[PDB]
Design an enzyme around this catalytic site. Sequence first.
Site, short mmCIF file in Angstrom:
data_model
loop_
_atom_site.label_atom_id
_atom_site.label_comp_id
_atom_site.label_asym_id
_atom_site.label_seq_id
_atom_site.Cartn_x
_atom_site.Cartn_y
_atom_site.Cartn_z
N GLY A 1 0.65 -1.31 0.01
CA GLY A 1 -0.04 0.10 0.01
C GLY A 1 0.53 1.24 0.12
O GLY A 1 1.96 1.25 0.03
N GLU A 2 0.12 2.29 0.06
CA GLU A 2 0.37 3.62 -0.07
C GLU A 2 0.50 4.46 1.20
O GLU A 2 -1.09 4.53 1.69
CB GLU A 2 -0.43 4.63 -1.27
CG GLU A 2 0.54 4.70 -2.51
CD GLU A 2 0.09 3.53 -3.55
OE1 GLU A 2 0.56 3.57 -4.49
OE2 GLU A 2 -0.84 2.85 -3.30
N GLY A 3 1.29 4.91 1.73
CA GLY A 3 1.23 5.83 3.21
C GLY A 3 1.01 7.34 2.37
O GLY A 3 1.16 7.68 1.22
N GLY A 4 0.67 8.35 3.36
CA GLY A 4 1.16 9.80 2.94
C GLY A 4 2.60 9.97 2.78
O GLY A 4 2.72 10.89 1.79
N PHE A 5 3.36 9.26 3.56
CA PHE A 5 4.88 9.71 3.47
C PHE A 5 5.74 8.75 2.74
O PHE A 5 6.98 8.70 2.58
CB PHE A 5 5.18 10.09 5.05
CG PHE A 5 4.64 11.07 5.39
CD1 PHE A 5 4.96 12.47 4.87
CD2 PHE A 5 3.80 11.31 6.60
CE1 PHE A 5 4.68 13.76 5.45
CE2 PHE A 5 3.19 12.60 6.76
CZ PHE A 5 3.71 13.60 6.42
N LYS B 1 8.85 0.55 4.93
CA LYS B 1 8.40 1.70 4.27
C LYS B 1 9.39 2.46 3.83
O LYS B 1 10.38 2.71 4.52
CB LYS B 1 7.65 2.51 5.50
CG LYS B 1 7.30 3.90 5.13
CD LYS B 1 7.04 4.60 6.58
CE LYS B 1 5.32 4.65 6.66
NZ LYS B 1 5.07 5.15 7.93
N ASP C 1 -2.17 12.96 13.37
CA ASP C 1 -2.72 12.30 12.33
C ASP C 1 -3.53 10.96 12.44
O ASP C 1 -3.04 10.06 11.84
CB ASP C 1 -1.71 12.32 11.11
CG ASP C 1 -2.24 11.99 9.53
OD1 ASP C 1 -3.68 12.56 9.58
OD2 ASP C 1 -1.43 12.51 8.71
N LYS D 1 -6.27 8.58 12.06
CA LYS D 1 -7.15 8.22 11.03
C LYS D 1 -7.07 6.92 10.81
O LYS D 1 -6.25 6.17 11.25
CB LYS D 1 -6.93 9.04 9.61
CG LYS D 1 -5.36 8.53 9.21
CD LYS D 1 -5.22 9.56 8.04
CE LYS D 1 -3.87 9.43 7.40
NZ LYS D 1 -3.88 10.09 5.99
#
Length: 287
Positions: free
Chosen positions: A29-33, A49, A143, A145
């Site tokens: 998957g994709e994180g914000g960072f 990551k 953050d 969420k």
Amino acid sequence: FHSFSFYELKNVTNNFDERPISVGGNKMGEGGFGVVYKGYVNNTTVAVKKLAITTEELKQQFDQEIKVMAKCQHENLVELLGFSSDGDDLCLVYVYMPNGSLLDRLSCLDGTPPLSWHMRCKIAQGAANGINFLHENHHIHRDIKSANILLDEAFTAKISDFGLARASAQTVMTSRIVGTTAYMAPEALRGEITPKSDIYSFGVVLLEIITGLPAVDEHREPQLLLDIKEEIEDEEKTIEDYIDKKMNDADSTSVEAMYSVASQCLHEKKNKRPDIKKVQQLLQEMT
Ligand SMILES: O=C(Nc1nc2cc(CN3CCCCC3)ccc2n1-c1ccccc1)c1cccc([N+](=O)[O-])c1
């Protein structure tokens, strides 16, 4: 903590193989960072990551993450096994969470079965327990969420992503406003830094849990899950209209009890919201 070299992480993760894991790839998957790839290191299945504004800033976040993880160990937080920092595609290595993110399990991404109410209820508790541990140790997350709530084999909720965290005296302001807007408290959107913004953001997570709806969806009306609370506070709708239909084990009483915790968390005025310890108590009383 353990220092790695880059190649060791590339290799084990199939040269950061972008093919999704649901089709034998490694991209989880994709994180914000950054981006997160599965792999196995010495028989330990792992998450790694690959970090992706400022050059001194992205570094500072990496540092903050390692600093928070060095101090905070708890079963409702992710666990850092170590990092890799010598390649400048900065890396952080964690114990692997099988069941991915709460966001993804709430959406049933890749065909996973809907979460039962019963399991949702323990997810909320564990998450609240994780945030409480952070606050006991004087950190504000900034953050909170559902993509930052990871889930293990037994669906134990764990909080992730501490790169934006701050120490928790008087009102602190910042010029650099950060977070995810569909989750952010009004005061956080104006640049205040306070643990009370974590409670608000958790309130939105509780609405995701109850309804099955993402915090924001541009192809929905309303786009913002928050607006839903206004329709219910005004007599226009009830929480029953929005309960996630992908469930059968959700009696009116515990849903409403969770919704009550949620709306409390969502007081638009920071000082009226309960503190995380209070939230914990209410979520145990709920069951
Ligand atoms: O484990 C981590 N991420 C992860 N595991 C996964 C397993 C499955 C497969 N899974 C198969 C069984 C059924 C459900 C889906 C699908 C997705 C997964 N994602 C993931 C999900 C969203 C974004 C990034 C990674 C992780 C652990 C510690 C720290 C961090 N971090 O972000 O710093 C990430």
